[PDB]
Design a binder for this molecule. Structure first.
Ligand SMILES: [Mg+2]
Ligand SMILES: [Mg+2]
Ligand SMILES: [Mg+2]
Lengths: 150, 150, 150
């Protein structure tokens, strides 16, 4: 099975930046409703999608209590619980993060380590790459992810 | 086999909106010479791509009378005919629709039912997720799609 | 295994345009430090991604004299070497190129032939499709690619 997901958020000065589950030192952070972790959101949608289960807007509306104030690993692990209950064995996640600042290169090890631990995948099965928008989208973070299961 | 397809269209106020084969009540709709159904176009290109057959610009140009003015479902069924004749067995389609309005949430069932009916896939093999652009692309509808076959 | 990658470049008047390893006659070309071949970059990142090896920013930085000034095909071939050494057999590449000008249609055969030769894949396993941005991004070339291996 395959799943594909995307996420993006406005970034603003003096807000915390969360990506791949981690708080990243940055001059900008998401202007969100959530922690705005675009990588987790894209991955979560990709997982749900692989089983036709909907998306984070359907399954995690803030109006449900359990989701209000929650960090995005809660959404990811619930999607993992849902596909696992349907017999899924996650094999791989490959995703691209796009943002002009800050540079994610120095945080490569930490970001992969976190995704590896969250999705319970070996490091060679976490394919994370970083891009800038080349001035296409200087005020957003963007994420696009593909997952592979069984 | 895997295929990847994308489409985007300018949205204009007061034009009809077509997605996944359906008319969706909306304040905005594609400005296009086609019906502008980004979902159909992205899926069609992904199917073509999975066999290297080209893209919808090549196979369904507005110059070709058989295709001019037709709804986009006609091009998807033709792409399905072409890949089926080359032995394809479509397994899964996962795609993301991005647009700032209207909300697609209320239409989720009919949209997924449509894709399942047109592509002849069970609903758990239709992975449809909805996003807004968070202000990055407030005047366009975008779709990106992955298909898996065989 | 699966890998996903993306690339974009600002386009500027009177610069040469390189795509899929070829010179493409054009009024606009990438402004950059590389040849700005978005197809090559996105394919290379997708390959690297399929094995968790990093991305082109990590492995091919212009601080490294081995890589500065090299054509992007040299990067793609090195990524091929690295995954092949880890047992991979590339099976398929499917990608989308997005740009408002020049038209890529007239170059389809040459572009696909180049990808086929470079990646040593049969033509039906090269899924290249072309799009314009519909004015979303009229001054960039964008590429997004999925690769499948084994
Ligand atoms: Mg989000
Ligand atoms: Mg279209
Ligand atoms: Mg590049």
């Amino acid at each position: 099975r395959i799943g594909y997901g995307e996420d993006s958020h406005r970034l603003e000065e003096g807000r915390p930046l969360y990506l791949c589950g981690l708080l990243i030192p940055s001059p900008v952070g998401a202007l969100a409703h959530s922690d705005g972790d675009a990588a987790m959101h894209a991955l979560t949608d990709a997982l749900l999608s692989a089983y036709g289960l909907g998306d984070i807007g359907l399954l995690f509306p803030d109006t449900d209590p359990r989701w209000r104030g929650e960090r995005s690993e809660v959404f990811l692990r619930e999607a993992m619980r849902l596909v696992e209950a349907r017999g899924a064995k996650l094999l791989q996640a490959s995703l691209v993060l796009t943002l002009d600042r800050p540079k994610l290169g120095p945080h490569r090890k930490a970001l992969v380590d976190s995704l590896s631990r969250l999705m319970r995948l070996p490091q060679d099965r976490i394919g994370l790459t970083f891009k800038t928008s080349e001035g296409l989208a200087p005020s957003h973070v963007q994420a696009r992810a593909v997952v592979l299961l069984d």
